[PDB]
Amino acid sequence: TLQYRGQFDVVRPVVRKLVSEMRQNPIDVLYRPKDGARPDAADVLMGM
Amino acid sequence: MAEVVDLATGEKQVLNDIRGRYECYTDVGPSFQSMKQQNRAEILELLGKTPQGTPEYQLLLLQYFTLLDGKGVEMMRDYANKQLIQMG
């Protein structure tokens, strides 16, 4: 088109924010044993 | 020995158990992943609210006892146990 089209573009900054937050709060898995399982049941698993 | 109590049951064939059931009323509380999870935290709660007195130390050992597998946890959990039994 022929008329000017520009970018105040407010939203990214909040996007980048959130990401920047989730990036430094990794959060992985855990695999606890179980109510009846012997203590060292997961380590194997998690180990890999 | 000539005395005992507190044994579990099979209840052989499918679908059986006494009709003297409901012995558990229903309350609510923070959701836990499993039992060992709850017991763990339930002890932490008990710590802090207790002085550095004796009963404290047991809780403590109890805590290590409850910890789940690891190079670290195993050895200490193992000490914690040894200690606790020897505590009698």
From Swiss-Prot, chain A:
Location in the cell: Virion
Assembly, per entry: Homododecamer. Interacts with the terminase large subunit; this interaction allows the packaging of viral DNA. Interacts (via C-terminus) with the head-to-tail adapter protein gp4; this interaction participates in the head completion. Interacts with the scaffolding protein; this interaction initiates procapsid assembly, thereby ensuring incorporation of only one portal ring per capsid. Interacts with the capsid protein.
Entry function: Forms the portal vertex of the capsid. This portal plays critical roles in head assembly, genome packaging, neck/tail attachment, and genome ejection. Procapsid assembly may initiate with a nucleation complex composed of portal and scaffolding proteins. The portal protein multimerizes as a single ring-shaped homododecamer arranged around a central channel. Switches upon genome packaging from an asymmetrical conformation in the procapsid (PC-portal) to a symmetrical ring in the mature capsid (MV-portal). This change of conformation may serve as a signal for headful packaging.
Family from the record: Belongs to the p22likevirus portal protein family.
Protein name: Portal protein
Organism: Salmonella phage P22
Gene: 1
UniProtKB/Swiss-Prot annotation, chain B:
Residues of the full protein shown: 493 to 580 of 725
Subcellular location, record wording: Virion
Function according to Swiss-Prot or TrEMBL: Forms the portal vertex of the capsid. This portal plays critical roles in head assembly, genome packaging, neck/tail attachment, and genome ejection. Procapsid assembly may initiate with a nucleation complex composed of portal and scaffolding proteins. The portal protein multimerizes as a single ring-shaped homododecamer arranged around a central channel. Switches upon genome packaging from an asymmetrical conformation in the procapsid (PC-portal) to a symmetrical ring in the mature capsid (MV-portal). This change of conformation may serve as a signal for headful packaging.
Disulfide bridges in this chain: none
Name listed for the protein in its UniProt record: Portal protein
Gene that this polypeptide is encoded by: 1
Source organism of the structure: Salmonella phage P22
Domain of life of the native organism: Viruses
Similarity comment: Belongs to the p22likevirus portal protein family.
Quaternary state and interactors: Homododecamer. Interacts with the terminase large subunit; this interaction allows the packaging of viral DNA. Interacts (via C-terminus) with the head-to-tail adapter protein gp4; this interaction participates in the head completion. Interacts with the scaffolding protein; this interaction initiates procapsid assembly, thereby ensuring incorporation of only one portal ring per capsid. Interacts with the capsid protein.
